[PDB]
Amino acid sequence: YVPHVPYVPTPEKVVRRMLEIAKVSQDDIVYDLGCGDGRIIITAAKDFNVKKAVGVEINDERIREALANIEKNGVTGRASIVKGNFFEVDISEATVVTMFLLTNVNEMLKPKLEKELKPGTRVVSHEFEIRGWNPKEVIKVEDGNMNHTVYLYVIG
Ligand SMILES: C[S@@+](CC[C@H](N)C(=O)[O-])C[C@H]1O[C@@H](n2cnc3c(N)ncnc32)[C@H](O)[C@@H]1O
Ligand SMILES: [Mg+2]
Structure with missing residues:
Protein backbone atom coordinates (compact mmCIF):
# COMPACT_ATOMS: atom_id res chain seq x y z
CA TYR A 1 0.00 0.00 0.00
CA VAL A 2 0.93 3.65 -0.34
CA PRO A 3 2.16 5.09 2.98
CA HIS A 4 1.30 8.50 4.47
CA VAL A 5 2.13 11.49 2.23
CA PRO A 6 2.00 15.10 3.51
CA TYR A 7 -0.19 17.55 1.63
CA VAL A 8 -1.17 21.17 1.55
CA PRO A 9 -4.85 22.00 1.27
CA THR A 10 -6.18 25.40 0.19
CA PRO A 11 -7.69 27.30 3.14
CA GLU A 12 -11.49 27.58 2.92
CA LYS A 13 -11.44 31.36 2.43
CA VAL A 14 -9.05 31.06 -0.49
CA VAL A 15 -11.23 28.34 -2.04
CA ARG A 16 -14.24 30.64 -1.90
CA ARG A 17 -12.28 33.59 -3.30
CA MET A 18 -10.91 31.44 -6.16
CA LEU A 19 -14.42 30.45 -7.19
CA GLU A 20 -15.66 34.05 -6.84
CA ILE A 21 -12.76 35.35 -8.94
CA ALA A 22 -13.55 32.84 -11.70
CA LYS A 23 -17.24 33.86 -11.40
CA VAL A 24 -18.30 30.27 -10.85
CA SER A 25 -22.02 29.75 -11.47
CA GLN A 26 -24.63 26.98 -11.83
CA ASP A 27 -23.93 26.29 -15.51
CA ASP A 28 -20.24 25.59 -14.87
CA ILE A 29 -18.35 22.32 -14.81
CA VAL A 30 -15.44 22.62 -12.38
CA TYR A 31 -12.32 20.43 -12.53
CA ASP A 32 -9.77 20.52 -9.71
CA LEU A 33 -6.36 19.19 -10.77
CA GLY A 34 -4.99 17.40 -7.72
CA CYS A 35 -8.09 17.66 -5.59
CA GLY A 36 -6.75 16.47 -2.24
CA ASP A 37 -9.53 16.14 0.34
CA GLY A 38 -12.03 17.41 -2.24
CA ARG A 39 -12.76 20.80 -0.68
CA ILE A 40 -12.67 22.80 -3.91
CA ILE A 41 -15.08 20.58 -5.82
CA ILE A 42 -17.28 20.24 -2.72
CA THR A 43 -17.45 24.01 -2.18
CA ALA A 44 -18.14 24.56 -5.90
CA ALA A 45 -21.09 22.17 -5.70
CA LYS A 46 -22.33 23.13 -2.22
CA ASP A 47 -21.90 26.91 -2.26
CA PHE A 48 -21.74 27.83 -5.96
CA ASN A 49 -24.37 25.36 -7.17
CA VAL A 50 -22.36 24.00 -10.08
CA LYS A 51 -23.96 21.36 -12.26
CA LYS A 52 -20.85 19.20 -12.10
CA ALA A 53 -17.57 19.19 -10.21
CA VAL A 54 -14.79 16.67 -10.80
CA GLY A 55 -11.73 16.24 -8.63
CA VAL A 56 -8.73 14.48 -10.14
CA GLU A 57 -6.35 12.87 -7.68
CA ILE A 58 -3.58 10.28 -7.70
CA ASN A 59 -3.16 9.62 -3.97
CA ASP A 60 -5.55 7.00 -2.59
CA GLU A 61 -5.32 8.41 0.96
CA ARG A 62 -6.61 11.73 -0.37
CA ILE A 63 -9.27 10.04 -2.51
CA ARG A 64 -10.67 8.13 0.46
CA GLU A 65 -11.00 11.43 2.35
CA ALA A 66 -12.52 13.23 -0.60
CA LEU A 67 -15.12 10.51 -1.21
CA ASN A 145 -2.57 36.11 9.59
CA MET A 146 -1.97 34.59 6.18
CA ASN A 147 -1.70 36.06 2.70
CA HIS A 148 -2.31 34.33 -0.61
CA THR A 149 -2.12 35.09 -4.32
CA VAL A 150 -4.72 33.91 -6.82
CA TYR A 151 -4.23 34.01 -10.60
CA LEU A 152 -7.05 34.00 -13.13
CA TYR A 153 -6.49 33.05 -16.77
CA VAL A 154 -8.97 32.88 -19.62
CA ILE A 155 -8.17 30.44 -22.42
CA GLY A 156 -7.80 32.28 -25.71
C1 LIG B 1 -1.31 21.28 -2.84
S1 LIG B 1 -2.48 19.90 -2.69
C2 LIG B 1 -3.99 20.82 -3.13
C3 LIG B 1 -5.28 20.01 -2.93
C4 LIG B 1 -6.56 20.77 -3.31
N1 LIG B 1 -6.65 21.05 -4.75
C5 LIG B 1 -6.68 22.06 -2.53
O1 LIG B 1 -6.35 23.12 -3.07
O2 LIG B 1 -7.10 22.07 -1.36
C6 LIG B 1 -2.05 19.11 -4.26
C7 LIG B 1 -2.75 17.78 -4.50
O3 LIG B 1 -2.46 17.38 -5.83
C8 LIG B 1 -2.19 15.99 -5.87
N2 LIG B 1 -1.37 15.74 -7.06
C9 LIG B 1 -0.08 16.15 -7.29
N3 LIG B 1 0.28 15.73 -8.53
C10 LIG B 1 -0.77 15.06 -9.07
C11 LIG B 1 -0.95 14.43 -10.30
N4 LIG B 1 0.01 14.39 -11.22
N5 LIG B 1 -2.16 13.83 -10.57
C12 LIG B 1 -3.18 13.84 -9.65
N6 LIG B 1 -3.00 14.47 -8.43
C13 LIG B 1 -1.82 15.07 -8.16
C14 LIG B 1 -1.53 15.69 -4.54
O4 LIG B 1 -1.67 14.33 -4.21
C15 LIG B 1 -2.27 16.64 -3.60
O5 LIG B 1 -3.41 16.01 -3.06
MG1 LIG C 1 -1.54 30.53 -0.25
Missing part, protein backbone atom coordinates in the same frame (compact mmCIF):
# COMPACT_ATOMS: atom_id res chain seq x y z
CA ALA A 68 -16.21 10.64 2.44
CA ASN A 69 -16.27 14.45 2.42
CA ILE A 70 -18.53 14.48 -0.63
CA GLU A 71 -21.08 12.40 1.30
CA LYS A 72 -20.68 14.39 4.53
CA ASN A 73 -21.44 17.58 2.61
CA GLY A 74 -24.43 16.17 0.76
CA VAL A 75 -23.16 16.80 -2.76
CA THR A 76 -22.84 13.23 -4.07
CA GLY A 77 -25.23 14.07 -6.89
CA ARG A 78 -22.88 16.58 -8.54
CA ALA A 79 -19.34 16.05 -7.24
CA SER A 80 -17.15 13.07 -8.13
CA ILE A 81 -13.55 11.90 -8.08
CA VAL A 82 -11.43 10.56 -10.92
CA LYS A 83 -8.49 8.48 -9.69
CA GLY A 84 -5.46 9.16 -11.81
CA ASN A 85 -2.62 11.41 -12.89
CA PHE A 86 -4.22 14.68 -13.98
CA PHE A 87 -1.78 14.91 -16.90
CA GLU A 88 -3.46 11.76 -18.26
CA VAL A 89 -7.08 12.58 -17.46
CA ASP A 90 -9.44 14.16 -19.98
CA ILE A 91 -10.45 17.59 -18.66
CA SER A 92 -11.95 18.93 -21.91
CA GLU A 93 -15.50 19.24 -20.53
CA ALA A 94 -14.38 21.73 -17.86
CA THR A 95 -15.53 25.35 -18.06
CA VAL A 96 -13.50 26.17 -14.93
CA VAL A 97 -10.19 24.53 -13.93
CA THR A 98 -8.74 25.06 -10.45
CA MET A 99 -5.16 24.32 -9.34
CA PHE A 100 -3.08 24.55 -6.16
CA LEU A 101 0.21 22.91 -6.99
CA LEU A 102 3.52 23.35 -5.16
CA THR A 103 5.93 21.79 -7.65
CA ASN A 104 7.32 23.18 -10.91
CA VAL A 105 4.78 21.68 -13.32
CA ASN A 106 4.35 24.77 -15.50
CA GLU A 107 6.08 23.62 -18.69
CA MET A 108 4.04 20.41 -18.65
CA LEU A 109 0.70 21.91 -17.69
CA LYS A 110 0.56 24.68 -20.32
CA PRO A 111 0.29 22.45 -23.40
CA LYS A 112 -2.36 20.17 -21.87
CA LEU A 113 -4.51 23.17 -20.97
CA GLU A 114 -4.28 24.79 -24.42
CA LYS A 115 -4.95 21.45 -26.09
CA GLU A 116 -7.99 20.30 -24.11
CA LEU A 117 -9.72 23.48 -22.91
CA LYS A 118 -12.21 25.39 -25.08
CA PRO A 119 -11.73 29.12 -25.65
CA GLY A 120 -13.29 31.05 -22.76
CA THR A 121 -12.53 28.36 -20.17
CA ARG A 122 -11.38 29.97 -16.92
CA VAL A 123 -8.29 28.69 -15.11
CA VAL A 124 -7.84 29.85 -11.53
CA SER A 125 -4.72 29.02 -9.52
CA HIS A 126 -3.63 29.40 -5.91
CA GLU A 127 -0.04 30.72 -5.92
CA PHE A 128 0.74 29.06 -9.23
CA GLU A 129 1.88 31.61 -11.77
CA ILE A 130 1.71 30.10 -15.24
CA ARG A 131 4.95 31.31 -16.95
CA GLY A 132 4.31 32.60 -20.49
CA TRP A 133 0.65 33.35 -19.91
CA ASN A 134 -0.94 36.72 -19.18
CA PRO A 135 -3.29 36.62 -16.20
CA LYS A 136 -6.65 38.36 -16.43
CA GLU A 137 -6.44 38.94 -12.68
CA VAL A 138 -3.84 38.67 -9.91
CA ILE A 139 -5.58 38.96 -6.55
CA LYS A 140 -4.18 39.04 -3.02
CA VAL A 141 -6.37 37.26 -0.48
CA GLU A 142 -5.94 38.06 3.22
CA ASP A 143 -6.65 34.99 5.37
CA GLY A 144 -6.32 35.80 9.06
Whole structure:
Protein backbone atom coordinates (compact mmCIF):
# COMPACT_ATOMS: atom_id res chain seq x y z
CA TYR A 1 0.00 0.00 0.00
CA VAL A 2 0.93 3.65 -0.34
CA PRO A 3 2.16 5.09 2.98
CA HIS A 4 1.30 8.50 4.47
CA VAL A 5 2.13 11.49 2.23
CA PRO A 6 2.00 15.10 3.51
CA TYR A 7 -0.19 17.55 1.63
CA VAL A 8 -1.17 21.17 1.55
CA PRO A 9 -4.85 22.00 1.27
CA THR A 10 -6.18 25.40 0.19
CA PRO A 11 -7.69 27.30 3.14
CA GLU A 12 -11.49 27.58 2.92
CA LYS A 13 -11.44 31.36 2.43
CA VAL A 14 -9.05 31.06 -0.49
CA VAL A 15 -11.23 28.34 -2.04
CA ARG A 16 -14.24 30.64 -1.90
CA ARG A 17 -12.28 33.59 -3.30
CA MET A 18 -10.91 31.44 -6.16
CA LEU A 19 -14.42 30.45 -7.19
CA GLU A 20 -15.66 34.05 -6.84
CA ILE A 21 -12.76 35.35 -8.94
CA ALA A 22 -13.55 32.84 -11.70
CA LYS A 23 -17.24 33.86 -11.40
CA VAL A 24 -18.30 30.27 -10.85
CA SER A 25 -22.02 29.75 -11.47
CA GLN A 26 -24.63 26.98 -11.83
CA ASP A 27 -23.93 26.29 -15.51
CA ASP A 28 -20.24 25.59 -14.87
CA ILE A 29 -18.35 22.32 -14.81
CA VAL A 30 -15.44 22.62 -12.38
CA TYR A 31 -12.32 20.43 -12.53
CA ASP A 32 -9.77 20.52 -9.71
CA LEU A 33 -6.36 19.19 -10.77
CA GLY A 34 -4.99 17.40 -7.72
CA CYS A 35 -8.09 17.66 -5.59
CA GLY A 36 -6.75 16.47 -2.24
CA ASP A 37 -9.53 16.14 0.34
CA GLY A 38 -12.03 17.41 -2.24
CA ARG A 39 -12.76 20.80 -0.68
CA ILE A 40 -12.67 22.80 -3.91
CA ILE A 41 -15.08 20.58 -5.82
CA ILE A 42 -17.28 20.24 -2.72
CA THR A 43 -17.45 24.01 -2.18
CA ALA A 44 -18.14 24.56 -5.90
CA ALA A 45 -21.09 22.17 -5.70
CA LYS A 46 -22.33 23.13 -2.22
CA ASP A 47 -21.90 26.91 -2.26
CA PHE A 48 -21.74 27.83 -5.96
CA ASN A 49 -24.37 25.36 -7.17
CA VAL A 50 -22.36 24.00 -10.08
CA LYS A 51 -23.96 21.36 -12.26
CA LYS A 52 -20.85 19.20 -12.10
CA ALA A 53 -17.57 19.19 -10.21
CA VAL A 54 -14.79 16.67 -10.80
CA GLY A 55 -11.73 16.24 -8.63
CA VAL A 56 -8.73 14.48 -10.14
CA GLU A 57 -6.35 12.87 -7.68
CA ILE A 58 -3.58 10.28 -7.70
CA ASN A 59 -3.16 9.62 -3.97
CA ASP A 60 -5.55 7.00 -2.59
CA GLU A 61 -5.32 8.41 0.96
CA ARG A 62 -6.61 11.73 -0.37
CA ILE A 63 -9.27 10.04 -2.51
CA ARG A 64 -10.67 8.13 0.46
CA GLU A 65 -11.00 11.43 2.35
CA ALA A 66 -12.52 13.23 -0.60
CA LEU A 67 -15.12 10.51 -1.21
CA ALA A 68 -16.21 10.64 2.44
CA ASN A 69 -16.27 14.45 2.42
CA ILE A 70 -18.53 14.48 -0.63
CA GLU A 71 -21.08 12.40 1.30
CA LYS A 72 -20.68 14.39 4.53
CA ASN A 73 -21.44 17.58 2.61
CA GLY A 74 -24.43 16.17 0.76
CA VAL A 75 -23.16 16.80 -2.76
CA THR A 76 -22.84 13.23 -4.07
CA GLY A 77 -25.23 14.07 -6.89
CA ARG A 78 -22.88 16.58 -8.54
CA ALA A 79 -19.34 16.05 -7.24
CA SER A 80 -17.15 13.07 -8.13
CA ILE A 81 -13.55 11.90 -8.08
CA VAL A 82 -11.43 10.56 -10.92
CA LYS A 83 -8.49 8.48 -9.69
CA GLY A 84 -5.46 9.16 -11.81
CA ASN A 85 -2.62 11.41 -12.89
CA PHE A 86 -4.22 14.68 -13.98
CA PHE A 87 -1.78 14.91 -16.90
CA GLU A 88 -3.46 11.76 -18.26
CA VAL A 89 -7.08 12.58 -17.46
CA ASP A 90 -9.44 14.16 -19.98
CA ILE A 91 -10.45 17.59 -18.66
CA SER A 92 -11.95 18.93 -21.91
CA GLU A 93 -15.50 19.24 -20.53
CA ALA A 94 -14.38 21.73 -17.86
CA THR A 95 -15.53 25.35 -18.06
CA VAL A 96 -13.50 26.17 -14.93
CA VAL A 97 -10.19 24.53 -13.93
CA THR A 98 -8.74 25.06 -10.45
CA MET A 99 -5.16 24.32 -9.34
CA PHE A 100 -3.08 24.55 -6.16
CA LEU A 101 0.21 22.91 -6.99
CA LEU A 102 3.52 23.35 -5.16
CA THR A 103 5.93 21.79 -7.65
CA ASN A 104 7.32 23.18 -10.91
CA VAL A 105 4.78 21.68 -13.32
CA ASN A 106 4.35 24.77 -15.50
CA GLU A 107 6.08 23.62 -18.69
CA MET A 108 4.04 20.41 -18.65
CA LEU A 109 0.70 21.91 -17.69
CA LYS A 110 0.56 24.68 -20.32
CA PRO A 111 0.29 22.45 -23.40
CA LYS A 112 -2.36 20.17 -21.87
CA LEU A 113 -4.51 23.17 -20.97
CA GLU A 114 -4.28 24.79 -24.42
CA LYS A 115 -4.95 21.45 -26.09
CA GLU A 116 -7.99 20.30 -24.11
CA LEU A 117 -9.72 23.48 -22.91
CA LYS A 118 -12.21 25.39 -25.08
CA PRO A 119 -11.73 29.12 -25.65
CA GLY A 120 -13.29 31.05 -22.76
CA THR A 121 -12.53 28.36 -20.17
CA ARG A 122 -11.38 29.97 -16.92
CA VAL A 123 -8.29 28.69 -15.11
CA VAL A 124 -7.84 29.85 -11.53
CA SER A 125 -4.72 29.02 -9.52
CA HIS A 126 -3.63 29.40 -5.91
CA GLU A 127 -0.04 30.72 -5.92
CA PHE A 128 0.74 29.06 -9.23
CA GLU A 129 1.88 31.61 -11.77
CA ILE A 130 1.71 30.10 -15.24
CA ARG A 131 4.95 31.31 -16.95
CA GLY A 132 4.31 32.60 -20.49
CA TRP A 133 0.65 33.35 -19.91
CA ASN A 134 -0.94 36.72 -19.18
CA PRO A 135 -3.29 36.62 -16.20
CA LYS A 136 -6.65 38.36 -16.43
CA GLU A 137 -6.44 38.94 -12.68
CA VAL A 138 -3.84 38.67 -9.91
CA ILE A 139 -5.58 38.96 -6.55
CA LYS A 140 -4.18 39.04 -3.02
CA VAL A 141 -6.37 37.26 -0.48
CA GLU A 142 -5.94 38.06 3.22
CA ASP A 143 -6.65 34.99 5.37
CA GLY A 144 -6.32 35.80 9.06
CA ASN A 145 -2.57 36.11 9.59
CA MET A 146 -1.97 34.59 6.18
CA ASN A 147 -1.70 36.06 2.70
CA HIS A 148 -2.31 34.33 -0.61
CA THR A 149 -2.12 35.09 -4.32
CA VAL A 150 -4.72 33.91 -6.82
CA TYR A 151 -4.23 34.01 -10.60
CA LEU A 152 -7.05 34.00 -13.13
CA TYR A 153 -6.49 33.05 -16.77
CA VAL A 154 -8.97 32.88 -19.62
CA ILE A 155 -8.17 30.44 -22.42
CA GLY A 156 -7.80 32.28 -25.71
C1 LIG B 1 -1.31 21.28 -2.84
S1 LIG B 1 -2.48 19.90 -2.69
C2 LIG B 1 -3.99 20.82 -3.13
C3 LIG B 1 -5.28 20.01 -2.93
C4 LIG B 1 -6.56 20.77 -3.31
N1 LIG B 1 -6.65 21.05 -4.75
C5 LIG B 1 -6.68 22.06 -2.53
O1 LIG B 1 -6.35 23.12 -3.07
O2 LIG B 1 -7.10 22.07 -1.36
C6 LIG B 1 -2.05 19.11 -4.26
C7 LIG B 1 -2.75 17.78 -4.50
O3 LIG B 1 -2.46 17.38 -5.83
C8 LIG B 1 -2.19 15.99 -5.87
N2 LIG B 1 -1.37 15.74 -7.06
C9 LIG B 1 -0.08 16.15 -7.29
N3 LIG B 1 0.28 15.73 -8.53
C10 LIG B 1 -0.77 15.06 -9.07
C11 LIG B 1 -0.95 14.43 -10.30
N4 LIG B 1 0.01 14.39 -11.22
N5 LIG B 1 -2.16 13.83 -10.57
C12 LIG B 1 -3.18 13.84 -9.65
N6 LIG B 1 -3.00 14.47 -8.43
C13 LIG B 1 -1.82 15.07 -8.16
C14 LIG B 1 -1.53 15.69 -4.54
O4 LIG B 1 -1.67 14.33 -4.21
C15 LIG B 1 -2.27 16.64 -3.60
O5 LIG B 1 -3.41 16.01 -3.06
MG1 LIG C 1 -1.54 30.53 -0.25
